[PDB]
Amino acid sequence: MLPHLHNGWQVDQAILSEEDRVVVIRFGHDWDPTCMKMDEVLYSIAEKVKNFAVIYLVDITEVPDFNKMYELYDPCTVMFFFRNKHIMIDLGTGNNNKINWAMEDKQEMVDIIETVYRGARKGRGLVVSPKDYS
């Protein structure tokens, strides 16, 4: 199934290693209920998005290095990177830095990732999600 990253060095390497794809990280725990729902979505779309994105899972207990600076206080946090930069997206939720709930509609996440990919490749640090989750 989906690859996991097991320490800070591996996370830095995953982000450093993509010149032309968005790095998608799910911070949480495989055992957490919200994560399970989100992981299933991520697994289901991974093949589909393979051309513009790669997805990793990070257990924030095994790998706590980022908990404070990325404010990983929600049970489930999905964040995006492109060429070693954190990419923000306006979801209309009041937090443009992360997707912090189990999105269960698979195609919505495909489209968000696509949006992040085009926007970031165009040099944007901030993109806007097609659907408004306010």
Partner: peptide, 25 residues
């Protein structure tokens, strides 16, 4: 939007920030 959210640092920048804090401490 006054006081707008800023992006987080790269994972490399965070690991570095963490390493610096241990140096000082």
């Amino acid at each position: 939007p006054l006081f707008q959210q800023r992006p987080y640092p790269s994972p490399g920048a965070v690991l570095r920030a963490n390493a610096e804090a241990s140096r000082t401490k």
